[PDB]
Structure formats: structure tokens, C-alpha cells
Design a protein around this ligand. Structure first.
Ligand code: TPP
Ligand code: MG
Length: 524
């Protein structure tokens, strides 16, 4: 058996059947003789390849396999990998290297010091010392990606390795199963349970790791039993709780003072699957007010170490959520009251307020719709106005890198064919990974793309204000025709210059057999 044959057998055996890629010289000996049980998903730029794999991985809650071309291909995907690091996305990033005999002279397409390139974004990076080590290197890649805390890994393979004889001993890798489904020991778990049972005014904060583990339901049961209000942690890359549930308090503001104020009065704050905290704006103050103690459950040692306050437990979010939900007592406390219904804003028959767009989407979209956000100035309004009852219903770039949602929406739609994906993307954001559209068209992945066209980098103008930053150049993006871009890449394009045009376009897009892009003329 060749290294080619053995690697594809290992991928097969580890449950991988999809290659997200953009091909190159160095990848031809990998991609040739492409097995019938695999599918190749081509994107036109490596940001878009990784974005699609990333969405695919997060929705399927399984590793996604990527093949890129050397330094240039790997480099083009670096922004995407930044998002993948923070989302703990299980991505196997493979890249072809020049033939072993030509690495020394640095022939064209040589990836120099290959393993250092993706650092520090990946959890593991590697170039095998020999062709016969490639399957073992791939096994390490798979498990390093899949073990908590999950994350992107990188493997560089000299193109001449694939044709070589594999080690017959490589067969022991095929069915390797590694488990990170661990929870705190009974003694320390009973202590934690007894502290939640005893809390006067408990508060729960959930991060993306809850949605990643599908711990949503256990957290709902946990919140019901403790009769406790629930927030999603700041800069939320995913939605870990039903947003119209009585306990839900919404998106936490990404500020130090703001969060301590919010938690004031809460004796015990339980944070699950979230960094403590992903602060964004400089909001100096106390991390916690007196009388509030914090306990953080995280699957990431880095997040436990980084926390400027509270106690931490490093464990599987799924296993811990299940354990806590089934062990805590029913509080005699009354269930928190559901948040108020959002206000309908004044809307004329002209350019649309973001609020109008989100109200419209909530009325018209299927109850199991999946949303992606890269409309950077409208995130707060989106969280308030979209009723997301089910797991895996929301995705935002984890590291805030733009160019995620458009590709990611295609990967989510591919993973969830029976759930309508609707990506709400700003006019600025749409450009970073615009070429991703071609993939939806070519593979007939029926993602709906809603472009919020305000002519500007809205969020930067708003932040310019907060920073008192005047005469900043490059904040406006006029003269972009998103329907012409969609047509450029074979995607049906509709326009919505007003509410009746929005209602029409959406009903059309919801009944379309293919991807549809709606260009929405939004205010400001
Ligand atoms: C790769 C990358 N480049 C730049 C930024 C900085 N950035 C943050 S928000 C933003 C503006 C996005 O504009 P748009 O999608 O039109 O949404 P709006 O702010 O108008 O709602 C930019 C450029 C980033 N986060 N990532
Ligand atoms: Mg904009």
C-alpha cells in the first residue's frame, strides 16, 4: 500500500469523506486517483476554502479536512485560521510541499520552515521527516484537531511522499479512538453542586463551547433547576441557549465594568464553555463586585489560566453540563421573567433600518433557520430580534476576522441540508471572501445571503466616535454592486430597497432551489 492509499484509508476510517481545497502543483500527487467515497469542494481562494470547512466543522460538530497549496495557499488562509483558533474549530489543514530533493535549493513552491508559518494560530504544526511517517503524522493531526480543546492543526507533506510505500504497521492508526469526554471527580463535583444548590441568586454565562458540545439542552435544564438568568458571553461566536427562553438575558456587553455591574447581586456566577471574558472595548473597573464569586468550566487550559478572576475546572463541556443539570436540586425560586418583546422601530417606505430586516427575518424564516452574522454594526439588534430556539442556529467570526460568514454559511448549509441558512453580511464584510459565492453556485448549496448595504464600515465609524478618532480615512465603501458580483459567480441576485421589496425577495429566496443573494439598501 502507498502513502496515498493508507492516508485515504485512515481518513475514511476516522469518518472523513470531504476535502475542502484549492489545488496546486504540490497537491496533485495527493488529489490524483481521488477515491469515489470522497467529495472535493473547490473554492477560488484559501480564505473561502477554510471558511467553508470551518462552517462545515462547527455545524457537523466533527473535524473538516482541508488541502491547500504550500506557503501562498496556507498564507491566504491565515485570517480564516485566526477565527478557527478562537472557535476551537476541528480543522485538519494540509498543504503540499516541494519534492524532498528540491526543498534544500528552495525551488519554486517550496514552503520554507513550513511548520512555523501557521504559528501561532494552530494547536499543532508539523512536516514529517519521511514519506512512511505521513500516515502517523495525519493520525496526530486528526486527534490533535479532535481532542478538547479542539482547534486547527497543520501538516505539510512533500509531494513525492504520496507514491512511496507506507509502513504496513500504519494499520494500527486506522481505528484509534481518543476520548476527552471527562468531568470533575465525584468529590469536587458534589462540592460544586452543593455550592450551586446553596447560591441565593445564581447567574449562568454560556460561551460557544456549549453550542459546540450540543450542551444547550442540559444548560436549559440547569438554568430551569437553579431558576437562574442566562447570558451569552461577549463577542459570542455561537448561540448556546434558546433566545426567547424566560431565563435568557441576551448578549453580555464586552466591557469589564459593564459585566461586573451586570453580575452585581449574584453570589455565584457559573460560566460554561466561554473565556472569562472576551472583553472588546476598554471599560476599566472591577472584574467582579464584592459578594460575587465566579466558577468557570472550560475545555481550554489557556482560558482557565487567562481568567483574571474566579475558580476554574478544565473538563468536557458536554460531560459537565449533563452532570450538573442532572445533579442540581430544583430551586423553590420563581423562574426569571422573559425579556420584553423588542420595539418595532419607525420604518417609512424607503431604505431599511436593520431592526426592520431582523423583524422581517424572524416573521418569515423557518423556526429551525441557521443564521450567520457579519453585519458588524447590527449584532446587538440581531441578538434581540431573532428567535433562535434550537442548537447550531448562530455563527459570528470568533476572532472577529472578516471574510468568515459568507464562506462559513456555505459550509453550514452543506452540513445541514434540511435547515435554511441565512447569512446577514455587511457591505464591507461581503468583499473579504466574495469569491466563496462561486462554490454555492457550482455545488447548488442553497444558502441565502442578505447583504446589509449601508455604503460603509458602520462599526468602525461608531468605534471612531467612542475612541474620539476623527479624520480616519478608509471607512466608506461606496460603488459596490452586490447583484453584479452575485451574477459574476452565478448566484441569483435580488434587490430590496424597501420593506415590501424585502418581504417579496425573502419569500422568493426561501422558495428558490439555489443560493440567492439579496442586496438590502439599509439606512446610514
Ligand atoms: C480581516 C479584517 N479586516 C478588518 C477588520 C476590521 N473591521 C471590523 S468591523 C469592520 C466593518 C465591517 O463593515 P460591514 O460589513 O459593512 O458592516 P457594518 O459595520 O457597516 O454594519 C471592519 C473593517 C476585521 N475585523 N477583519
Ligand atoms: Mg456596512
Amino acid at each position: 500500500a502507498s502513502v496515498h492509499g493508507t492516508t485515504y484509508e485512515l481518513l475514511r476510517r476516522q469518518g472523513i469523506d470531504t476535502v475542502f481545497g484549492n489545488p496546486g502543483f504540490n497537491e496533485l500527487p495527493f488529489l490524483k486517483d481521488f477515491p469515489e467515497d470522497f467529495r472535493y469542494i473547490l473554492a477560488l481562494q484559501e480564505a473561502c476554502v477554510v471558511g467553508i470547512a470551518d462552517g462545515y466543522a462547527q455545524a457537523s460538530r466533527k473535524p473538516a479536512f482541508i488541502n491547500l497549496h504550500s506557503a501562498a495557499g496556507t498564507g491566504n488562509a491565515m485570517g480564516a485560521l485566526s477565527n478557527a483558533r478562537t472557535s476551537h474549530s476541528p480543522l485538519i489543514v494540509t498543504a503540499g510541499q516541494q519534492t524532498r530533493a528540491m526543498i534544500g535549493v528552495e525551488a519554486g513552491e517550496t514552503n520554507v520552515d513550513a511548520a512555523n508559518l501557521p504559528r501561532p494560530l494552530v494547536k499543532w504544526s508539523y512536516e514529517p521527516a519521511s514519506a512512511a511517517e505521513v500516515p502517523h503524522a495525519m493520525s496526530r493531526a486528526i486527534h490533535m484537531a479532535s481532542m478538547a480543546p479542539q482547534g486547527p492543526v497543520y501538516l505539510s507533506v512533500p509531494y513525492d511522499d504520496w507514491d512511496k510505500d507506507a509502513d504496513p504497521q500504519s494499520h494500527h492508526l486506522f481505528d484509534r479512538h481518543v476520548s476527552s469526554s471527562v468531568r470533575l471527580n465525584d468529590q469536587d463535583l458534589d462540592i460544586l453542586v452543593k455550592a450551586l444548590n446553596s447560591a441565593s441568586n445564581p447567574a449562568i454565562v454560556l460561551g460557544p463551547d456549549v453550542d459546540a458540545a450540543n450542551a444547550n439542552a442540559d444548560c436549559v435544564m440547569l438554568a430551569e433547576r437553579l431558576k437562574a438568568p442566562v447570558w451569552v458571553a461577549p463577542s459570542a461566536p455561537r448561540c448556546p441557549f434558546p433566545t426567547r427562553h424566560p431565563c435568557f438575558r441576551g448578549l453580555m456587553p464586552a466591557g469589564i465594568a459593564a459585566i461586573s455591574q451586570l453580575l452585581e447581586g449574584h453570589d455565584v456566577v457559573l460560566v460554561i464553555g466561554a473565556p472569562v471574558f472576551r472583553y472588546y472595548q476598554y471599560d476599566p473597573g472591577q472584574y467582579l463586585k464584592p459578594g460575587t464569586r465566579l466558577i468557570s468550566v472550560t475545555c481550554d487550559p489557556l482560558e482557565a489560566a487567562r481568567a483574571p478572576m474566579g475558580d476554574a475546572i478544565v473538563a468536557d463541556i458536554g460531560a459537565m453540563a449533563s452532570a450538573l443539570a442532572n445533579l442540581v436540586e430544583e430551586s423553590s425560586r420563581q423562574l426569571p421573567t422573559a425579556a420584553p418583546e423588542p420595539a418595532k422601530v419607525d420604518q417609512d417606505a424607503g431604505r431599511l433600518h436593520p431592526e426592520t430586516v431582523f423583524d422581517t427575518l424572524n416573521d418569515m424564516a423557518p423556526e429551525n433557520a441557521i443564521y450567520l452574522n457579519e453585519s458588524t454594526s447590527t449584532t446587538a439588534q440581531m441578538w434581540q430580534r431573532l428567535n433562535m430556539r434550537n442548537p447550531g442556529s448562530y455563527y459570528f467570526c470568533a476572532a472577529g476576522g472578516l471574510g468568515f460568514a459568507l464562506p462559513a454559511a456555505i459550509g453550514v448549509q452543506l452540513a445541514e441540508p434540511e435547515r435554511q441558512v441565512i447569512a446577514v453580511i455587511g457591505d464591507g464584510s461581503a468583499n473579504y471572501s466574495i469569491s466563496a459565492l462561486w462554490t454555492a453556485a457550482q455545488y447548488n448549496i442553497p444558502t441565502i445571503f442578505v447583504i446589509m448595504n449601508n455604503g460603509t464600515y458602520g462599526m468602525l465609524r461608531r468605534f471612531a466616535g467612542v475612541l474620539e478618532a476623527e479624520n480616519v480615512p478608509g471607512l466608506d465603501v461606496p460603488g459596490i454592486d452586490f447583484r453584479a458580483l452575485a451574477k459574476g459567480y452565478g448566484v441569483q441576485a435580488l434587490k430590496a430597497d424597501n420593506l415590501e421589496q424585502l418581504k417579496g425577495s425573502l419569500q422568493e429566496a426561501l422558495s428558490a432551489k439555489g443560493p440567492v443573494l439579496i442586496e438590502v439598501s439599509t439606512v446610514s
